[PDB]
Amino acid sequence: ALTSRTELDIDPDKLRESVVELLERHPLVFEGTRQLALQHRPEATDPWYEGCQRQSLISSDSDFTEVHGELRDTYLGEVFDRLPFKPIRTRIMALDPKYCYSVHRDLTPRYHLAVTTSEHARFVFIEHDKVLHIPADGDLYYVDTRQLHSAFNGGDDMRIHIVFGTDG
Template sequence: MDVTPEWVVDGLVAKVRLGLDAEALRMAASELIARHPLIHDSTKQLSLQIRKGSDDPWYESCFRDADIAPETEYDMLNPELEDTYFKEVFAAFPFPVFRARLMALTSRHCYSVHHDETPRFHVAIETSKHAPFVFVDRNEVFRVPADGDGYWLDTRQEHTAMNGASDLRIHLVVGLDQWA
């Protein structure tokens, strides 16, 4: 599969066609969240990938980078997801991924401005025009559409995300070394 980005915006964002069924992904996420609640009051997360020997497979990788094992160790699909649409989703990624999480941003909340050690790859599951991603130093705003495709974001740059809508913003977020 060709992993050349379809387009790039000022070196900050690149779209990669995954061709996922956006509705099937939305349903799979909804069913999973019904079984395993999201945590963290304003930055709700659920781990989809685990590391060998994990004691808390659904939540262990949901903490700050400094408080978890090296993020590249979270590289195995949670066994409970083997017979779900998530297995197809992970098979669609044209490169190795790690520390995959469902990340939800509650209504009228914003993440603190920060930067990550590696770029992140986002697949929007639930979003709206009121849930932008902002590259702070560059004064660039981007909205990740829930279109079944993936978006490489250079989160090594200072950024934040906000949700001014009345519903949850939910993204599948993975770490990757591709295009690092």
């Protein structure tokens, strides 16, 4: 319901290595929550960043279906192959040190795969009085972000997740 953990058996070190090499070639945009789109709409002219725009500017998360071709022969492409669901509008989502989100609701739930994190990173459900830490254990963590929530990174380094949108 609120959360779930699905066994993916991703190796966290190889995932970390692959994300770091990718960000070297396609850097994150924005400052507090830094982002990089891993899926794009068909015929997107700005595929790496269109998906990172504010929700009031997003046609529909469902249009963001295309995994970038340059990922397919990387470890990230293998991650996509292992997903038990059809992802939409997947993004790298990075929290700067000491950064947090507003308390908000999203339109759909989402899956997280933690890339780099610490004990100082938590996801908080406001109305259900639940605090969750998403570990970089190579498994996939569902969070029903339609519920009122925030997330924060009280650590000294960036907290990097891959966040997959979902339909069904």
